[PDB]
Design a protein around this ligand. Structure first.
Ligand code: COD
Ligand code: CL
Ligand code: MG
Length: 163
């Protein structure tokens, strides 16, 4: 037969309950799921790689078939390196759908073995993005409903260093 491996790439800055839903769902359909955190040298995350991985491990580590790894560079090279079956993305909105369709096609031209599968969020996570969460935290709003508890605490230990 064979054994399947999907990469879920993102900045996860921070992880949200949305991402958690998607990884859980994906872990039911594939043998190995790789949560791949883009380091993002030229992109300026709020949380470091180390915080980002830690918060991820903290929310999804209870799934036996999920790994966590930082990467930079070209997704397709990461894809080959990781001997992956497919990439997983979530599609929240029309712009997501437009972007990811283009990207899939581009990656298939860079690597004929490339593959993208997509999941749609349940309605209770449809409105959640990392960006929105950062903005709400920044303005001292309460993000508890939308993110795992560790992430709440992480926001505080930044508001506590000052932010
Ligand atoms: C796509 C990049 C920028 C990272 O993505 P992003 O910044 O969206 O990460 P984020 O963690 O916010 O989202 C993760 C993924 O799950 C989806 N998602 C986010 N929130 C939710 C939610 N609540 N419900 C469902 N899905 C969601 C997103 O749409 C996204 O596809 C990254 O893959 C990348 O750029 N890789 C390398 C660069 C590259 O090779 N570029 C050019 C050729 S590809
Ligand atoms: Cl982002
Ligand atoms: Mg997001």
């Amino acid at each position: 037969m064979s054994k399947t491996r999907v990469i879920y790439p993102g900045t996860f800055d921070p992880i949200t309950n949305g991402h958690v839903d998607l990884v859980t769902r994906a872990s039911r359909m594939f043998d190995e799921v790789v949560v791949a955190i883009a380091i993002g040298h030229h992109k300026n995350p709020l949380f470091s790689l180390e915080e980002r991985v830690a918060l991820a491990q903290s929310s999804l580590g209870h799934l036996s078939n999920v790994e966590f790894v930082g990467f930079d560079g070209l997704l397709v090279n990461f894809f080959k390196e990781q001997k992956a079956t497919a990439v997983l993305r979530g599609l929240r909105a029309v712009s997501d759908f437009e972007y990811e369709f283009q990207l899939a096609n581009m990656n298939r031209q860079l690597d004929p073995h490339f593959e993208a599968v997509f999941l749609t969020p349940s309605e209770q996570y449809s409105f959640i993005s990392s960006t929105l969460i950062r903005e709400i935290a920044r303005l001292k709003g309460d993000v508890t409903k939308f993110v795992p508890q560790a992430v709440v605490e992480a926001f505080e230990r930044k508001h506590q260093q000052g932010w």
